[PDB]
Amino acid sequence: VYASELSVMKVDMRHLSLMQRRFPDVLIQARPSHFWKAVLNDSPEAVKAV
Amino acid sequence: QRPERIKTTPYLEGDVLSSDSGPLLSVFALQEIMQKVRQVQADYM
């Protein structure tokens, strides 16, 4: 279970990290801390607690 | 709000010990200067 929840967290960040180069007019101040905080909110609690 | 005061990893999560401000240290700095001089002059001739 825990090895299959890290895999969802990486595919979510492999595709979110291109949102700034694709849409520069919406994300002018979105530093890469901002898509780190967003995936950790939508992730299960017992995976970040590990 | 600002992108440097945002914490993701819980390494910088500590207990708040005390808080000092702007106009609380400036009066404090003027006290500890004159307290040193009024103590030195009161011990020697």
3-state secondary structure chain A: CCHHHHHHHHHHHHHHCCHHHHCCCCCCCCCCCHHHHHHHHCCCHHHHCC
Q: What's the CA gap between A18 and A16, in Å, rounded? A: 5
Provide, as residue numbers in chain B, all residues whose Cβ is less than 8 Å from the Cβ of A40.
8
Say if residues A7 and A26 touch (Cβ distance below 8 Å): no
Cα torsion through A36, B2, A46, A10, rounded to 10: 0
Say if residues A7 and A43 touch (Cβ distance below 8 Å): no
Q: Give the angle A33-B20-B18 at the CA atoms, nearest 5°.
A: 80
Say if residues A13 and A6 touch (Cβ distance below 8 Å): no
Say if residues B30 and B37 touch (Cβ distance below 8 Å): no
Tell me which H or E stretch contains B23.
helix B22-40
- Given an 8 Å threshold on Cβ–Cβ distance, is B8 in contact with A33? yes
- Given an 8 Å threshold on Cβ–Cβ distance, is A40 in contact with B3? no
Cα torsion through A25, A29, A30, A33, rounded to 10: 170
Q: Which of A6, A19, A15, A14 is nearest to A47 (CA)?
A: A6
Say if residues A50 and A9 touch (Cβ distance below 8 Å): no
Provide, as residue numbers in chain A, all residues whose Cβ is less than 8 Å from the Cβ of B11.
none
A37 CA: distance to closest CA in chain B (Å) = 6
Cα nearest neighbour of A37 on chain B:
B8
CA A19 to chain centre: 11
- Given an 8 Å threshold on Cβ–Cβ distance, is B8 in contact with A36? yes
How many angstroms is the resolution?
3.7
Q: What's the CA gap between B8 and B6, in Å, rounded? A: 7
Say if residues B3 and A31 touch (Cβ distance below 8 Å): yes
